[PDB]
Ligand binder design. Structure first.
Ligand SMILES: CNS(=O)(=O)c1cc(C(=O)N2CCc3nc(N)ncc3C2)co1
Length: 167
């Protein structure tokens, strides 16, 4: 039993809700919140911008030190950093950004990072400003992630479309 509430069950291990991931994280304080990161951990907009703003820019300060030490992530890769006031940990995962021409096949590799964590609160990778089809992202999620994932979808119209079209 866990504290996640109001989710629709899609499969044995994948759940979905129309929710603001920032507000959901603030309320649940999950062990892991996933950020829709880029390779530079520049949290300017989208989910990353929102999560970072909610940490009063502490996420960005920590991220800048991480990059200065380690260099950029790979597309499809991840790193574990602090969850600040939102979660114990933040798993920064880089899905491919279609608006930069990155290979969508890397979306499966990106979701594989979730399997290193038993339970996660997460957005749909490569959705939103990353330019991928969120229906495709949900399909890859369900077919790749084996651990327990609670998906927060900000847009109510999109949430209803994702549910109604789910196979
Ligand atoms: C209250 N001030 S606000 O400017 O109107 C406002 C901005 C945002 C926001 O940018 N995001 C990022 C996109 C997003 N994606 C998921 N999956 N979940 C949550 C979010 C929230 C929310 O609220």
């Amino acid at each position: 039993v866990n504290s996640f509430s109001g989710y629709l069950k899609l499969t044995d291990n994948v759940y979905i809700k129309n929710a603001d991931i920032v507000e959901e994280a603030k309320k649940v304080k999950p062990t892991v919140v996933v950020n829709a990161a880029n390779v530079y951990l520049k949290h300017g907009g989208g989910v990353a911008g929102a999560l970072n703003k909610a940490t009063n820019n502490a996420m960005q300060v920590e991220s800048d030190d991480y990059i200065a030490t380690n260099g950029p992530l790979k597309v499809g890769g991840s790193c574990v950093l602090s969850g600040h006031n939102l979660a114990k940990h933040c798993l920064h995962v880089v899905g491919p950004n279609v608006n930069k021409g990155e290979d969508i096949q890397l979306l499966k590799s990106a979701y594989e990072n979730f399997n290193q964590h038993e339970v996660l609160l997460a957005p749909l990778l490569s959705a939103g400003i990353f330019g991928a089809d969120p229906i495709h992202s949900l399909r890859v999620c369900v077919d790749t992630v084996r651990t327990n994932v609670y998906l927060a979808v900000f847009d109510k119209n999109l949430y209803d479309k994702l549910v109604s079209s789910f196979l």
